[PDB]
Amino acid sequence: MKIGIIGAGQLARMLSLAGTPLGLEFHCLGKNGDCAEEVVKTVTDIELTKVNDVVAWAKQFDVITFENENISHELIKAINHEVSVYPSAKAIAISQDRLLEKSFMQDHGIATAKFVNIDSLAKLQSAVDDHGLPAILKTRRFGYDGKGQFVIRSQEDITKAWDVLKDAPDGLIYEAFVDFDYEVSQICTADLKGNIAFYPLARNTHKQGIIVESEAPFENVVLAEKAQQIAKILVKEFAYVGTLAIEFFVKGDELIVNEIAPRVHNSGHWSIDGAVTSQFENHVRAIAGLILGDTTSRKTVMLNCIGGMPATKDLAALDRVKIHSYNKEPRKGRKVGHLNLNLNDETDEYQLLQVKKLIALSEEIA
Amino acid sequence: MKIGIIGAGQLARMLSLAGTPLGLEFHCLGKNGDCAEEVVKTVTDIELTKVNDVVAWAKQFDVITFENENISHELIKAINHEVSVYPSAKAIAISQDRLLEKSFMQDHGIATAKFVNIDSLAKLQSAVDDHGLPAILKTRRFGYDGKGQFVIRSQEDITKAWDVLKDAPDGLIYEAFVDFDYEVSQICTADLKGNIAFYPLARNTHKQGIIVESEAPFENVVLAEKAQQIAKILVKEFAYVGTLAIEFFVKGDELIVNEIAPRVHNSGHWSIDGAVTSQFENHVRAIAGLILGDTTSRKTVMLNCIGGMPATKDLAALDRVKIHSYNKEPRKGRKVGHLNLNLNDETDEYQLLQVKKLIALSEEIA
Numbered sequence: 001m002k003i004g005i006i007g008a009g010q011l012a013r014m015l016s017l018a019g020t021p022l023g024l025e026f027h028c029l030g031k032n033g034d035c036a037e038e039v040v041k042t043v044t045d046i047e048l049t050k051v052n053d054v055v056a057w058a059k060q061f062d063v064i065t066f067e068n069e070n071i072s073h074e075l076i077k078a079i080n081h082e083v084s085v086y087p088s089a090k091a092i093a094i095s096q097d098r099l100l101e102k103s104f105m106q107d108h109g110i111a112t113a114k115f116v117n118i119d120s121l122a123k124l125q126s127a128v129d130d131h132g133l134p135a136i137l138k139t140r141r142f143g144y145d146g147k148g149q150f151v152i153r154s155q156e157d158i159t160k161a162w163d164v165l166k167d168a169p170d171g172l173i174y175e176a177f178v179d180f181d182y183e184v185s186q187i188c189t190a191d192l193k194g195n196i197a198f199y200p201l202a203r204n205t206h207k208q209g210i211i212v213e214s215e216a217p218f219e220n221v222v223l224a225e226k227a228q229q230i231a232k233i234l235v236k237e238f239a240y241v242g243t244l245a246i247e248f249f250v251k252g253d254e255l256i257v258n259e260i261a262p263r264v265h266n267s268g269h270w271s272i273d274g275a276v277t278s279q280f281e282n283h284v285r286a287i288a289g290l291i292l293g294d295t296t297s298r299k300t301v302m303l304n305c306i307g308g309m310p311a312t313k314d315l316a317a318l319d320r321v322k323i324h325s326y327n328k329e330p331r332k333g334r335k336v337g338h339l340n341l342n343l344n345d346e347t348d349e350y351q352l353l354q355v356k357k358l359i360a361l362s363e364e365i366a
Numbered sequence: 367m368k369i370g371i372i373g374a375g376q377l378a379r380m381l382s383l384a385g386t387p388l389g390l391e392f393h394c395l396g397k398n399g400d401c402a403e404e405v406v407k408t409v410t411d412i413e414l415t416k417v418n419d420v421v422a423w424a425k426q427f428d429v430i431t432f433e434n435e436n437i438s439h440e441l442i443k444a445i446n447h448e449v450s451v452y453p454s455a456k457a458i459a460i461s462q463d464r465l466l467e468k469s470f471m472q473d474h475g476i477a478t479a480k481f482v483n484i485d486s487l488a489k490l491q492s493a494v495d496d497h498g499l500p501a502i503l504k505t506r507r508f509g510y511d512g513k514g515q516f517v518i519r520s521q522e523d524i525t526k527a528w529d530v531l532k533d534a535p536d537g538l539i540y541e542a543f544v545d546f547d548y549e550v551s552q553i554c555t556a557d558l559k560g561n562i563a564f565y566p567l568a569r570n571t572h573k574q575g576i577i578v579e580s581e582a583p584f585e586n587v588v589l590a591e592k593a594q595q596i597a598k599i600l601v602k603e604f605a606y607v608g609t610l611a612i613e614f615f616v617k618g619d620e621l622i623v624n625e626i627a628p629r630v631h632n633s634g635h636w637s638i639d640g641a642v643t644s645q646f647e648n649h650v651r652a653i654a655g656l657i658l659g660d661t662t663s664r665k666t667v668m669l670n671c672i673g674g675m676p677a678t679k680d681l682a683a684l685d686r687v688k689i690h691s692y693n694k695e696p697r698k699g700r701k702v703g704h705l706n707l708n709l710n711d712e713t714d715e716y717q718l719l720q721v722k723k724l725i726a727l728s729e730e731i732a
């Protein structure tokens with residue numbers, strides 16, 4: 001079977017790494033020299049606006065998936081008319097727009113931050129009067145790593161925020177600050193028949209709006225149950241096939257949806273080395289029409305390498321650390337790799353502290 | 367760092383699968399369309415007799431290794447003059463010739479089958495008179511999967527055996543049958559400094575001269591100690607760097623060396639899914655000058671898929687089985703993949719029996 005992936009970045013790279021031993025063949029649409037290239041059969045660089053050409057490319061393969069939900073959902077719908085694409089155009093459309101995403105949650109009685117669509121400065125001032133400060137003005141689309149937003153605490157910030165972001169082509173959204181204690185994410189995978197394989201919750205730590213650490217399983221039976229029920233609704237309503245990620249704010253035993261990504265997700269990279277079947281292998285199994293792999297898991301920490309990565313020689317000296325370099329070009333704010341470590345004993349804690357020390361020396365976050 | 371691999375078969379494929387997340391780049395010398403191609407950066411098809419061209423290719427890279435010890439050890443020595451090759455020309459020379467291999471063991475007080483170099487029919491008759499029947503006449507070189515040999519039990523078999531094999535360009539060897547209860551193998555990896563990382567013993571089951579099943583760890587502290595000591599001698603004498611495989615006959619608490627392979631080996635494929643660091647990742651680490659990864663292991667069975675492989679859909683239904691298709695062309699006697707399964711509980715035994723049933727339907731051994 002041949003799987004086409006829109007995107008040739010690190011997620012596609014890891015999808016191919018996971019799915020290739022299954023006997024599947026991988027082809028990417030992306031730029032040559034992108035990091036998935038050396039682990040896939042072909043990479044073809046087609047401009048994504050050239051719809052007919054993208055479709056023509058897609059039809060060479062048996063199933064299509066994608067690594068970035070920011071892509072055109074009409075493009076997906078076109079492709080899907082001709083060759084199966086997972087997950088759905090609906091999942092893309094809803095997950096890629098903060099307004100549609102939060103509105104969807106609200107429509108199904110699922111908690112989010114209080115939010116207001118912002119199409120004028122007055123609308124913004126009204127949202128601040130209603131729902132308070134601090135708050136964030138965000139682009140509805142193409143936001144990533146906390147970019148494309150402006151935090152608001154003073155009245156003077158309102159006009160400043162508006163002046164910067166007002167011309168964002170796909171609009172804006174006001175979000176009120178959420179009162180939360182910590183953050184977790186629910187990753188799961190849904191097969192062709194709607195069966196869902198669940199990972200345990202992962203507790204995610206952020207720095208400057210970028211995820212820097214993920215630890216799983218996060219043990220809280222109450223919270224896990226709620227997350228799974230929320231996951232189930234999304235899978236049903238999206239008729240979802242593939243790996244799905246849901247990020248939550250946690251306050252007490254209440255979960256609040258932050259946002260979702262219709263794909264394998266940074267907060268699940270731990271499963272490469274902490275689960276019997278990773279988020280990547282299971283995404284591939286799902287879209288290939290196969291029964292999903294067992295997701296039994298063991299305590300694992302994932303550490304992100306942003307802007308830089310410690311020398312492989314130094315990493316290798318911590319002989320239990322599992323190394324995941326994406327073979328990317330070091331650059332401030334750029335995710336160039338991650339590290340996984342199972343945590344069983346004190347010797348693991350030792351290496352962990354040592355890993356964090358190495359990361360602190362190499363890391364460059366924006 | 368760039369690693370050149372002589373060979374583009376399944377071992378090179380798995381070497382790249384293991385080493386790529388380490389941030390290493392892989393290039394093979396082999397035929398285009400070979401199974402390593404889709405997971406490496408380049409495959410270059412150079413005739414191996416064209417020595418200068420092979421060397422020219424090799425110098426593009428930082429270190430060279432190989433997946434098949436049947437290659438020319440003088441070729442290796444030439445390459446190594448210009449760019450580091452691991453393991454050594456010595457390891458190749460000794461391991462690739464049954465006579466040199468057994469003579470080496472004898473020279474170091476290591477048990478093997480009784481053996482005699484055969485260069486005439488009389489020599490053969492003399493070896494039979496001396497060391498008895500049954501016995502095997504084998505080619506000294508290029509034997510694999512039990513091919514290139516003739517078993518001898520009757521006096522009439524002697525002349526028959528000789529008539530078939532007499533013109534083997536690199537000669538022949540008589541081996542007397544070994545009295546043994548079962549077979550095990552010791553795989554280990556030696557780094558640039560001579561540090562060795564040991565895997566637990568694997569108990570190997572053969573059918574028609576081909577390995578069909580490998581189970582690890584094989585728990586016998588006495589036997590393991592002897593194996594490690596034998597492994598150590600080889601590493602020192604070969605000045606060995608890389609993964610090394612030693613196959614043994616077992617009788618009581620005595621080990622008898624069968625043969626060695628200077629490389630990752632079928633009997634270690636279980637470590638992909640049963641060890642913290644696989645034989646493949648550790649070979650790559652070794653040759654790349656890195657500290658080796660922890661080899662803590664869990665009970666795992668590996669089953670070979672020979673001649674054929676069960677449908678991925680059927681395999682996937684056994685959701686704990688780890689699938690390793692080499693994406694190869696089905697053909698009698700051909701190793702087209704393997705399956706790994708951790709064994710912890712009764713549910714695993716269930717899937718295991720079910721795997722074996724599937725394999726029995728797809729398998730074609732010669």
Ligand SMILES: Nc1ncnc2c1ncn2[C@@H]1O[C@H](COP(=O)(O)O)[C@@H](O)[C@H]1O
Pocket residue numbers: 113136138143144145146147175176177178179183206209258259
């Ligand atoms: N309404 C909010 N209240 C508090 N923190 C937020 C809010 N929205 C986003 N964040 C932070 O921003 C991170 C993700 O940013 P984003 O790219 O907007 O999803 C989250 O993990 C939070 O730390």
Ligand SMILES: Nc1ncnc2c1ncn2[C@@H]1O[C@H](COP(=O)(O)O)[C@@H](O)[C@H]1O
Pocket residue numbers: 479502504509510511512513541542543544545549572575624625
């Ligand atoms: N001298 C011997 N006595 C008994 N069995 C042998 C002998 N030599 C080889 N074998 C069998 O042949 C297999 C490997 O064949 P080869 O390719 O010759 O190493 C071993 O695993 C044994 O089952």
